[PDB]
Amino acid sequence: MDPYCPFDALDVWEHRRFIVADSRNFITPEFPRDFWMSPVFNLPRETAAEQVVVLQAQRTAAAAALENAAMQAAELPVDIERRLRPIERNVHEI
């Protein structure tokens, strides 16, 4: 599991002012790796397929309601022509 390395370790005694070829040490945190929990991708409760099914069912319900509105609102011209024509004839009777 350990990444491979030709050099095990050596003894280095750094100074402050004369760090020549200023490197970038790999910093490490101080909290134990036991507190650093492993990652888990929390899967969503629903799937996009179930989303499609539910949204399509809702679209079917909305379309049924819109069709009901259409059949109730398509007769209004029929009401117009059923109500005024007898009255227009009555006015013509004068």
Binding site: A63, L66, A74, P77, L84, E88
Partner: protein
């Protein structure tokens, strides 16, 4: 002579023009529900 003859003009002007009042109302109010039907059909398009 022109008493009754002109008196009939009042009833003529009232009734014969109330006649086409209903005609213009028919011509105008029928052109309103078509827009409502078009709007609801576009709503059905958007779903």
């Amino acid at each position: 002579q022109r008493t009754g003859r002109s008196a009939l003009a009042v009833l003529i002007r009232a009734c014969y023009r109330l006649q086409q009042q209903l005609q213009r109302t028919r011509r105008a109010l029928l052109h309103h529900s078509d827009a409502v039907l078009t709007s609801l059909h576009h709503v059905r398009m958007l779903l």
